[PDB]
Ligand binder design. Sequence first.
Ligand SMILES: C[C@]12CC[C@@H]3c4ccc(O)cc4CC[C@H]3[C@@H]1CC[C@@H]2Nc1ccccc1
Lengths: 228, 242
Amino acid sequence: NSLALSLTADQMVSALLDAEPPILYSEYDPTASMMGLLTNLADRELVHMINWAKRVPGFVDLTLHDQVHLLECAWLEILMIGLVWRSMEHPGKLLFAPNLLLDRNQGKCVEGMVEIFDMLLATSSRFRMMNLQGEEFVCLKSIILLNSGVYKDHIHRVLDKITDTLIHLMAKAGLTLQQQHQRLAQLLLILSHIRHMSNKGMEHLYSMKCKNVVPLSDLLLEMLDAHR
Amino acid sequence: KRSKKNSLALSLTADQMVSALLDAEPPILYSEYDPPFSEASMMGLLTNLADRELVHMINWAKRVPGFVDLTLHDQVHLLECAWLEILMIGLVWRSMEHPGKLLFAPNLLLDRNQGKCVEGMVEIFDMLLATSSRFRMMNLQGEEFVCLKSIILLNSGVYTFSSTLKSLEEKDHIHRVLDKITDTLIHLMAKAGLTLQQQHQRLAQLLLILSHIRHMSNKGMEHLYSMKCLSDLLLEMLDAHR
Ligand SMILES: C[C@]12CC[C@@H]3c4ccc(O)cc4CC[C@H]3[C@@H]1CC[C@@H]2Nc1ccccc1
């Protein structure tokens, strides 16, 4: 049944690198509603995330509404770890799309996002200091999808394999056994901060949802209403 | 053990750290309650119990090695951010041998259907039980539990402190103490006969659960805020989460 545990660690990494979504650009010309492009891009990236999740090993090995459950719980976490990953080499800026940067002051047009924005910046600055590698990133993102909504046994055996994968990357990188388990802990503790930002962004969008401007996507509303 | 430059946490061995975190444990509190529940009755007990555990949590954090090396403001900030995470990890630990029920206090043990007495607590109650069931399937030990609770205290609010060189030293201190607790967790797993692959998987499984504890803390923080209108100390912690 479960052919996701027979993967090579090299295969495990190679699958996640090519399953990555395409690159998305903001189709705007700067001059308005800064709350229009983020929600539009978040709307656009949710479609490929649904396509991306199908290519995550072990994801299609379970029930359709279990797949929806994991996606609806982690959809904002996945967008955030991806955003934090892209903004690493851009200190003080959050590359939503290569056409959009928005540093804190420029990003602060919107009320209530002053703190979430600087939580994403510090998370990006945290990945920068650790020099997070892309192969490590795709492993953490898959962990986010599988772990955010489990509370089953099959999901854990894939997660246990991603841990061995992450460890396999660090040992290949020359890190000692102590440096390996220390770096494993540092990365997974960041996921707790990503979850914290995910719950804050859900409440921020909700209060702004029950307002006239500016229209949210049906998919964005659908994924948000899954959190009640 | 003086400065962040030569903190006690980094001069202790693995088992001396376990001995420090096990002895730092706060006393087990009992509920000032006479056992028939009402909606305001069970609300009054849990918020009275949470406030009395908050007072002893403040003194507990000062006995976690390396915590008193931070500034007094940064000490309060870590407590303000993780106070509910700390209350909930203790509850799910106390409830491992009480399946389907949550042991808030040795005289205050609640089941799933009792948790409907407080409207909107149902969703939080099942998550707490599913996590206590989670720790039950892993047979989490007390030595590992006190490590995870100290990881929560130090890590939850670490990235929410001035852009100064002194602020960075506060950040680097927490990370070095956290690396110290990581080696302690690994040392406990190596003692129990677990292989290095097992030593990395279980450490990963434990820390991923902390992400669920953070989730339940944000759900319990919002519901508690919608349920207000609670001691001033409990409100002080809640207003710190906006
Ligand atoms: C916030 C909370 C009541 C406090 C609970 C608690 C108390 C002591 C303790 O050692 C652990 C815990 C963990 C769970 C905490 C509950 C989460 C849901 C509750 N909310 C609430 C809001 C208004 C009135 C009563 C309870």
